[PDB]
Design an enzyme around this catalytic site. Structure first.
Site, short mmCIF file in Angstrom:
data_model
loop_
_atom_site.label_atom_id
_atom_site.label_comp_id
_atom_site.label_asym_id
_atom_site.label_seq_id
_atom_site.Cartn_x
_atom_site.Cartn_y
_atom_site.Cartn_z
N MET A 74 -3.70 -6.49 -1.33
CA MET A 74 -2.89 -7.00 -0.22
C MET A 74 -3.64 -8.01 0.64
O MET A 74 -3.00 -8.80 1.34
CB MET A 74 -2.40 -5.85 0.66
CG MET A 74 -3.49 -5.16 1.47
SD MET A 74 -2.91 -3.57 2.11
CE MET A 74 -4.44 -2.88 2.77
N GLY B 192 0.81 -1.21 0.00
CA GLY B 192 0.00 0.00 0.00
C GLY B 192 0.84 1.26 0.00
O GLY B 192 0.54 2.20 0.74
N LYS C 7 3.27 1.82 5.96
CA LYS C 7 3.17 3.17 6.49
C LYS C 7 1.76 3.70 6.27
O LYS C 7 1.29 3.75 5.13
CB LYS C 7 4.19 4.11 5.83
CG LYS C 7 4.01 5.56 6.27
CD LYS C 7 5.16 6.41 5.79
CE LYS C 7 4.74 7.86 5.68
NZ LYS C 7 3.81 8.05 4.54
N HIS D 288 -3.48 1.73 10.18
CA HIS D 288 -4.45 2.57 10.86
C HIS D 288 -5.74 2.75 10.07
O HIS D 288 -6.71 3.31 10.61
CB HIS D 288 -3.84 3.94 11.22
CG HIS D 288 -3.72 4.89 10.06
ND1 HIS D 288 -3.75 6.26 10.23
CD2 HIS D 288 -3.55 4.68 8.74
CE1 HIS D 288 -3.60 6.85 9.06
NE2 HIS D 288 -3.48 5.91 8.13
N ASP D 289 -5.79 2.27 8.82
CA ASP D 289 -7.01 2.27 8.02
C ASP D 289 -7.98 1.15 8.38
O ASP D 289 -9.14 1.21 7.97
CB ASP D 289 -6.68 2.12 6.52
CG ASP D 289 -5.89 3.28 5.96
OD1 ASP D 289 -5.80 4.34 6.61
OD2 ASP D 289 -5.36 3.13 4.84
N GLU E 183 3.73 4.72 11.78
CA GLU E 183 2.43 5.24 12.18
C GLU E 183 2.63 6.24 13.30
O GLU E 183 3.62 6.18 14.04
CB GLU E 183 1.48 4.13 12.65
CG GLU E 183 1.12 3.06 11.62
CD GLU E 183 -0.09 3.43 10.78
OE1 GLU E 183 -0.50 4.61 10.78
OE2 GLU E 183 -0.64 2.52 10.12
N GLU F 221 -6.44 4.75 15.27
CA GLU F 221 -5.07 4.88 15.74
C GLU F 221 -4.86 4.02 16.98
O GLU F 221 -5.81 3.71 17.71
CB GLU F 221 -4.73 6.35 16.04
CG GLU F 221 -4.98 7.30 14.86
CD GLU F 221 -4.13 6.98 13.64
OE1 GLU F 221 -3.01 6.46 13.81
OE2 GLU F 221 -4.59 7.24 12.50
N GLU G 167 0.41 -1.70 -4.83
CA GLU G 167 -0.75 -0.82 -4.65
C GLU G 167 -1.90 -1.25 -5.54
O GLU G 167 -1.78 -2.14 -6.40
CB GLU G 167 -0.39 0.63 -4.96
CG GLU G 167 -0.09 1.47 -3.74
CD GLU G 167 -1.33 1.85 -2.95
OE1 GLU G 167 -1.16 2.48 -1.89
OE2 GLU G 167 -2.46 1.52 -3.38
N1 LIG Z 1 -6.60 -3.96 -0.73
C1 LIG Z 1 -5.56 -3.15 -0.91
N2 LIG Z 1 -4.41 -3.64 -1.49
C2 LIG Z 1 -3.31 -2.84 -1.68
N3 LIG Z 1 -3.36 -1.52 -1.29
C3 LIG Z 1 -4.47 -1.01 -0.72
C4 LIG Z 1 -5.59 -1.81 -0.51
N4 LIG Z 1 -6.54 -1.04 0.07
C5 LIG Z 1 -6.05 0.22 0.23
N5 LIG Z 1 -4.77 0.24 -0.25
C6 LIG Z 1 -3.84 1.40 -0.29
O1 LIG Z 1 -3.31 1.72 0.98
C7 LIG Z 1 -2.91 3.07 0.98
C8 LIG Z 1 -3.14 3.69 2.37
S1 LIG Z 1 -2.77 5.47 2.43
C9 LIG Z 1 -1.01 5.20 2.76
C10 LIG Z 1 -0.17 5.37 1.50
C11 LIG Z 1 1.33 5.33 1.75
N6 LIG Z 1 1.72 4.07 2.39
C12 LIG Z 1 1.75 6.52 2.60
O2 LIG Z 1 2.13 6.37 3.76
O3 LIG Z 1 1.70 7.67 2.15
C13 LIG Z 1 -3.70 3.76 -0.14
O4 LIG Z 1 -2.80 4.32 -1.07
C14 LIG Z 1 -4.52 2.67 -0.79
O5 LIG Z 1 -4.49 2.72 -2.20
#
Ligand SMILES: Nc1ncnc2c1ncn2[C@@H]1O[C@H](CSCC[C@H](N)C(=O)O)[C@@H](O)[C@H]1O
Ligand SMILES: Nc1ncnc2c1ncn2[C@@H]1O[C@H](CSCC[C@H](N)C(=O)O)[C@@H](O)[C@H]1O
Lengths: 343, 345
Positions: free
Chosen positions: B231, B187, B244, B248-249, B276, B308, B210
């Site tokens: 992923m 990601g 990174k 937290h998502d 994070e 978080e 990604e």
């Molecule tokens: N199922 C999945 N497989 C791969 N990536 C994913 C995903 N679901 C969300 N993401 C990706 O996870 C990222 C989280 S935002 C973080 C982006 C980057 N790591 C940074 O720190 O700036 C997003 O860009 C989103 O495209």
């Protein structure tokens, strides 16, 4: 240099939306009702929220968390978790003994229609003469006559503000003493006149408003509701009240309103203006915010409107035919001003 | 009770919209261009704004004075009128030598799609299993980015700017990238993180893993190979993995799934490097708390499952996913680098 914590400037949009959520969840009344200086856990607050969501307390804690760090709530971290109480800044979110708080104003100001228009305030800088009327297609008051939810939310916001303003006015200002008749030009749903009349029962009140506002005004004794358009004329009046009306309009339209008032008054009549007054020196203080907050809301809702200094209000009065001006500071920038027609 | 000034709590919604306007009008760069301690009048700022509106300075002053009263700008009243300068809090709005500022992040988090979803965060309290964004918009945030190119771009640029900012701080403290030869960023956004790492450590071969719509938006970075995928189905084989602002998502269940796929893709001795903000146990009016509470509230609205976490919670995730060794590296003001180590014999 501190770009890292500068990302935290996103808190500026998170905080008002967390506050709106907490208001809508009735958080502050729940805390206040628990006891004089109660500090409640999220689970104790959720106990008074109509939900059967087991994750509600965890979710609520995420909102109250932000409010506590922002000094809107007190936050004491104990071993089983955080507990939350009211602060000086959040006392105003709890209704008084007549059921009035700042909540109606706070919900209106952050309502969707207002926040949507806020995206275009840069257009007032960039584009001459452009105006809500972009974002929405008509002026704000016409939109209110058309969208009843906005009409209600705005009318209730102004009514709550009216009780709050006049509760302060009556501690300082005695000019309503000898009056017998008062016409409230743009007087909202009539709350201002009802407040005045309850204090001075000898006053005959006439509320002069747009039809879609009058349609939803309750009947207060001693108050008669009249529909009209203040730019075309105002009813004959011994005295006129003008509260939070002039700040809606540019100088030309404010002069027009005041000239119509002048034409309706007899010799010796008075226009009583109630507005916040823009201070000469702006800073981080209540008197500054009290004017800058409605000023910015005007810039997005009716940008012709603006907040004004004492010198500007005197200039409007003199341009409209009034001979004498008198200024009565009330509290933290709120003023009563008398525009006297000559005798 | 001061109900009268409590009406001033309406300033809380005015302030971010005033700041967004000032950002879009380039106010902060204009002030900085005049000098380090420059204090400009609205008329002088408008001189650098492409507008022919003679009322622009009066209108701009109405926005600026609110920012000045709220300590985002300095506001000084002179005989001719007010003048405005940068403060410690607004320096971050001026781009650095590479053109990087917090602006891309600030514009995304006050974007219409984000703010509209904010109106439903109370639904997370009231309704079990609900979607502030997924309710507001009919699909999850990442799918919505796939569908609305302007949101894809705003989000990707926000994360990219945050990545440069984050790693500029990381490299002052953390030396763990030194001996690595390969790093798969799970990601990894548009690849800015890997580009920052590789430019400091040119021997590292980077793989950016990604979603397709993010890759399509990404530039070509030297040493970075883009691979599209999901992923949750699996992660490409990796000597080490970067995670990174991903964990937290997601809720614990899905965070563990991600970390288990990372474990399966790593050889013995490989490492997941997690970056994070860390939620402190005791919160207050300080940067370290706001640095965690602010993305926490954004996650509540954008993908409520996300949250978080404390150091104890991160350690629990790592252990539940098969990593028996964890190391914590505080960086600055709540930002941590964390290493989840897969065991060697
Ligand atoms: N199922 C999945 N497989 C791969 N990536 C994913 C995903 N679901 C969300 N993401 C990706 O996870 C990222 C989280 S935002 C973080 C982006 C980057 N790591 C940074 O720190 O700036 C997003 O860009 C989103 O495209
Ligand atoms: N042309 C017009 N004629 C009469 N009232 C008008 C008007 N245009 C706008 N208004 C009214 O002006 C009011 C301004 S808001 C102020 C309401 C009230 N005086 C108070 O202090 O709370 C609104 O209620 C709106 O309905």
């Amino acid at each position: 240099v501190n770009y890292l914590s500068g990302l935290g400037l996103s808190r500026l949009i998170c905080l008002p939306m967390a506050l709106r959520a907490a208001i809508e969840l009735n958080v502050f009344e729940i805390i206040f009702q628990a006891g004089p200086e109660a500090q409640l856990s999220p689970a104790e607050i959720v106990a008074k929220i109509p939900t059967k969501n087991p994750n509600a307390a965890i979710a609520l804690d995420r909102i109250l968390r932000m409010l506590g760090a922002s000094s809107i709530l007190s936050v004491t971290t104990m071993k089983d978790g955080r507990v939350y109480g009211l602060t000086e800044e959040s006392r105003c979110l709890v209704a008084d003994k007549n059921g009035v708080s700042v909540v109606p104003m706070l919900l209106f100001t952050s309502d969707k229609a207002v926040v949507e228009s806020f995206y275009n305030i840069k257009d007032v800088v960039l584009e001459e003469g452009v105006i809500f009327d972009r974002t929405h297609g008509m002026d704000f008051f016409a939109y209110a006559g058309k969208e009843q939810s906005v009409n209600k939310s705005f009318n209730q916001a102004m009514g709550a503000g009216s009780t709050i303003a006049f509760d302060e006015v009556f501690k300082v200002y005695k000019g309503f003493h000898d009056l017998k008749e008062l016409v409230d030009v743009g007087g909202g749903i009539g709350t201002s006149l009802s407040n005045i009349i309850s204090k001075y029962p000898h006053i005959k009140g006439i509320n002069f408003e747009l039809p879609h506002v009058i349609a939803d005004a309750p009947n207060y004794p001693g108050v008669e509701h009249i529909a009209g358009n203040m730019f075309e004329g105002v009813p004959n009046a011994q005295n006129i009240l003008l509260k939070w009306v002039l700040h809606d309009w540019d100088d030309e339209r404010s002069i027009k309103i005041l000239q119509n008032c002048w034409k309706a008054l007899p010799e010796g009549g008075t226009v009583i203006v109630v507005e916040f007054v823009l201070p000469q020196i702006l800073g981080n203080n209540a008197e500054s915010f009290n004017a800058l907050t409605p000023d910015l809301l005007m810039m997005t809702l009716n940008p012709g409107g603006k907040e004004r200094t004492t010198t500007e209000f005197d200039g409007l009065a003199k341009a409209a035919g009034f001979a004498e001006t008198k200024f009565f500071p009330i509290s933290q920038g709120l003023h009563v001003m008398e525009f006297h027609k000559a005798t």
